[PDB]
Amino acid sequence: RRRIAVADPEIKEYLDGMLARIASHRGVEHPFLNAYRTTALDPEQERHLFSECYYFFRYLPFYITGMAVKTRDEMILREIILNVADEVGSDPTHSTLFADFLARIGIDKEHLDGYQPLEVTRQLNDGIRHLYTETSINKALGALYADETMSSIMVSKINDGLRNQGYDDDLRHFWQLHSNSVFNAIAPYVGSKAARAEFEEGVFEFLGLVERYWDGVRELVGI
Amino acid sequence: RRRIAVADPEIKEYLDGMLARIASHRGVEHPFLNAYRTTALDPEQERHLFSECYYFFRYLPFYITGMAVKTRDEMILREIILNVADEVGSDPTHSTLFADFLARIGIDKEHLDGYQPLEVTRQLNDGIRHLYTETSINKALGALYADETMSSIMVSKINDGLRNQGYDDDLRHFWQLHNSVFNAIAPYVGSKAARAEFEEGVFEFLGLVERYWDGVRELVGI
Ligand SMILES: [Mg+2]
Ligand SMILES: [Mg+2]
Ligand code: NA
């Protein structure tokens, strides 16, 4: 079926439209993130932003691995494994690089352990775990497609804000760290309208969590 | 905790002792496998042996990935990902190389789909899935240690038998593809209670493999 799907010009057209719908979604093109690109923060504002990011990011590599039990498709497993291998395959791992960045901007492990993140942050982290491990493979692939498309944009915006704050490229290294492979894997799963409905449900449930997350963070840091 | 375990001299001795207990287990050092190393098989014997192996091997990469939800240790996740990346990370995948070997010895997909494997073969495949996804992290790590230690020995014995049958290295390519594991597992074999779960995972895995080769030996015969 994948060998038929990759040959269907309509499937390429559909997934290209979903790329644009994701990138233009308010959860990705968020006012707070665009504001942060040009608005420096004071120490307490910056401490709040990246402490919430820590609880957003925590244990996400383990959540996507829970998708593998729901499929027997090796192209799907390859995409999952490739993403996790990028995060933990070598040293330093991504989470180790993130904790180092936090320490270099005055947010140490001791403060993070005592930090109580927003409920929308807990709902985002738990919501991602639910989408990858407790939903249909088509729905989970929609969330994965949204995650993969968004992540690069989001980190570029935070990289912009940190550069505007005055940090050098070395400090911002964590935020300055396959399209055909991702298209090849997903194509057979967006053929029928029922599969696309599950696919889009996962895309917009994922992005809805991110949007409500950035809404809560925006109020916490303010302006 | 990991640097205390890796610095503990007893943990190195314990896991090295487990290595020997695994390789000397009858599920690994099995009479049928050693017999096959020097005994060629007729077409029906060979078809039965590797058809059971196919249902043994099927979907194992997906099973070990189900271990990752049971831990938040990135060294365990790295070991899981590293193993799966070897099987499906690149093309051709291991299963694709295996299906090609089967076809090259007269076992096509068409026959495999209609093949009903032995019950010990179903129990071995399902048992591995259960051990990696439905057991404690210490127990699943025992199964993972047994699998990683045994697999290299097992494929070498099968490679020997296929070479004895007369197949060349090109055809046997799939069977000729065979500190990080110690670092990952060391914190999980510190106490005797943790070792009890670890050893339970080691010997439950090997018990499944032994009973599998027992059934294959009876199926293949003389
Ligand atoms: Mg600071
Ligand atoms: Mg043959
Ligand atoms: Na051997």
Curated annotation (Swiss-Prot), chain B:
Catalytic activity annotation: 4-chloro-L-lysine + AH2 + O2 = L-2-amino-4-chloropent-4-enoate + formaldehyde + A + NH4(+) + H2O
Keyword annotations of the record: Amino-acid biosynthesis, Antibiotic biosynthesis, Iron, Metal-binding, Oxidoreductase, Plasmid
Cofactor binding annotation: Binds 2 Fe(2+) ions per subunit.
Pathway(s) the chain acts in: Amino-acid metabolism; Antibiotic biosynthesis
E.C. number(s) listed in UniProt: 1.14.99.-
SMART domains hit by this protein: Haem_oxygenase_2 (SM01236)
Named cofactor requirement(s): Fe(2+)
Entry keyword annotation includes Chloroplast: no
Keyword match Glycosyltransferase: no
Phenotype caused by lack of the gene: Cells lacking this gene no longer produce detectable amounts of L-propargylglycine and L-beta-ethynylserine, that are terminal alkyne-containing amino acids produced by wild-type S.cattleya.
NCBIfam families from the UniProt entry: ChlAlygly_Syn_BesC
Entry protein name: 4-chloro-allylglycine synthase
